[PDB]
Symmetry: C6
Subunit: 30 residues, 6 copies
C-alpha cells in the first residue's frame, strides 16, 4: 500500500538523521 511506502520513506529519513547526529557529535567533540 501507498501509506506503508510513506512510512518506509520516513523510516529511511529517520536513519539519515541518525547518521547526521552521529557525525555532528563527532564535530562537537573535535
Amino acid at each position: 500500500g501507498e501509506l506503508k511506502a510513506i512510512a518506509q520513506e520516513l523510516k529511511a529519513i529517520a536513519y539519515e538523521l541518525k547518521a547526521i547526529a552521529k557525525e555532528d557529535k563527532a564535530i562537537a567533540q573535535g
Copy 2:
C-alpha cells in the same frame, strides 16, 4: 494502522532532530 506507523516515524524524526540541536548548541557554546 499505517497512519499510526507514520506518526511513529515522525516521532523518531523529532527525536533525532533534538539530538542534532543538542550537538549544535555544543558547537555554538564552545562545548
Copy 3:
C-alpha cells in the same frame, strides 16, 4: 485521531528545526 497525531509530530519537528536554526545563527554570527 491519527491525522492530528501526525500534525502534532510535525509541530515537534518544526520546533526542533527552529532550535537548530537558532544555534546555527549563533554559530554564523560568532
Copy 4:
C-alpha cells in the same frame, strides 16, 4: 481539517529549513 493542518506544519518546516540554509551559506562564505 487535519490534512490542511498537516500542510501548514510542512510549511513551517520548510520555513525553518530555509533559515538554516541561510545560516549555512553565511558560514560557508565568511
Copy 5:
C-alpha cells in the same frame, strides 16, 4: 486537493535540503 498541497510542501522541503547540501559541501570542500 489537500494531498496535492502536502506533496507541494514536501517538494519545497526537498528544495531547501538541496540548498543545505550545497552549502555544507562548500563548507567541507575547503
Copy 6:
C-alpha cells in the same frame, strides 16, 4: 495519485539527507 507523489518526495528528501550526512562526515574527519 498524490499518495504516491508524497512517497516520491519523501524519497527525494532521504536522498538529500544522505548527501548531507556524507558532507558532515567529511567535516568531522577533516576530509
